[PDB]
Amino acid sequence: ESADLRALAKHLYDSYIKSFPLTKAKARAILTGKTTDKSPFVIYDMNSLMMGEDKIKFKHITPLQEQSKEVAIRIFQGCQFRSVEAVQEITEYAKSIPGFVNLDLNDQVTLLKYGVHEIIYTMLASLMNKDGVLISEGQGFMTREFLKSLRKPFGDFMEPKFEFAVKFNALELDDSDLAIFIAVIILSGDRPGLLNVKPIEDIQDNLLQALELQLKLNHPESSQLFAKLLQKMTDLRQIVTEHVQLLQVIKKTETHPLLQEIY
């Protein structure tokens, strides 16, 4: 019992570290100033973004020459590109969750299709503070006020998440906590169209225990942390559906053929 819980806890942690480049500990260190010795390039306005490209050579999303002429759009484009990377990082992590690869292939896909956003938002918080967000592997920091400062719906998107990031991080969880947490979200037995809910649930349950214990040791001081963390899941749901809203709101823009398919 209290044996396995601490075993599965370390595994997930050890795995999460081996799947996510920029950890919560890292990103945290940076933002503050603490030992890393190489401050980030601050995108605070236009000339900053402009200079940013050729410095943080995040010239990944930036390239696709001829669709590189309108900040707000070239940014959101980039957000998506890195979002696709995350998904691969997540899917990989998923498969280290004890039992996950043993499920019906169909349900794995399903659990993943419905869990990446909630997971993306959760981790994103790790890289943002009340003032801004860490971009490009930690190299940059795009101020928060610059984001609200975007043309159309292009300036609403990031405002919510900031609002959500502030509360979430107010719980002061670290990578060892988040690792378990994230697996719980993945093993969500309510994802639409599943086929065999029992296994999933039997797994999430084992996960929920591991997490509850993880919280009591790593946080003796904080009462009912486990409960507060679970409630946050509601914030993710709302947040995610909402995001999926403007995604359709934005479908009145950008007005390559292969570019689209990749997304």
Ligand X SMILES: *C(/C=C\C/C=C\CCCCC)=C\C(=O)C/C=C\CCCC(=O)O
Spatial distance between the Cα atoms of 240 and 34, rounded to a whole number of angstroms:
32
Per-residue mark of binding to ligand X, 38-67 (x: CB under 6 A): ----------------------x-------
Which amino acid appears at position 134 of this protein?
L
Q: Are 217 and 142 in contact (CB under 8 A)?
A: no
**Residue 263 marked in a binding site:** yes
The conformation of residue 102, written as its DSSP 8-state character, comes to: G
Query: Is 209 near its own copies (CB under 8 A)?
Result: yes
Residue 73 binding partner per list its own copies, ligand X, none, with a CB distance cut-off of 5 to 8 Å that depends on partner kind: none
Q: C-alpha distances in angstroms, 117 versus 87, 160, 169, 239?
A: 9, 14, 18, 9
Query: Is 25 near ligand X (CB under 6 A)?
Result: no
Q: Which of 31, 76, 68, 77 is nearest to 50 (CA)?
A: 68
Q: Which stretch binds ligand X (CB under 6 A): 8-16, 20-28, 177-185, 203-211?
A: 20-28
Pick from 67, 106, 238, 245 the residue near its own copies by CB under 8 A.
Answer: 238
Q: Which residue, 20 or 146, is less far from ligand X as judged by CB? A: 20
Minimum Å gap between C-beta 237 and its own copies is 5
Residue 72 binding partner per list ligand X, its own copies, none, with a CB distance cut-off of 5 to 8 Å that depends on partner kind: none
Q: Which stretch binds ligand X (CB under 6 A): 63-71, 81-89, 181-189, 217-225?
A: 81-89
| Burial category of 52 from C-beta neighbours within 10 Å (exposed 0-12, middle 13-18, buried 19 and up) | buried
**Residue 82 marked in a binding site:** yes
Q: Give residue for tokens 């039992």.
A: 99
Spatial distance between the Cα atoms of 26 and 123, rounded to a whole number of angstroms:
12
Minimum Å gap between C-beta 17 and ligand X is 11
How would you classify the pairing of strands 140-143 and 132-135?
antiparallel
Q: Which residue, 68 or 83, is less far from ligand X as judged by CB? A: 83
Minimum Å gap between C-beta 22 and ligand X is 4
Q: How many residues bind ligand X (CB under 6 A)?
A: 21
Provide the H-helix boundaries in 33-148.
Answer: 46-53, 71-94, 105-113, 116-126, 144-148
**Residue 11 marked in a binding site:** no
As annotated, the binding site for rosiglitazone includes 80-83, 117, 243, 263
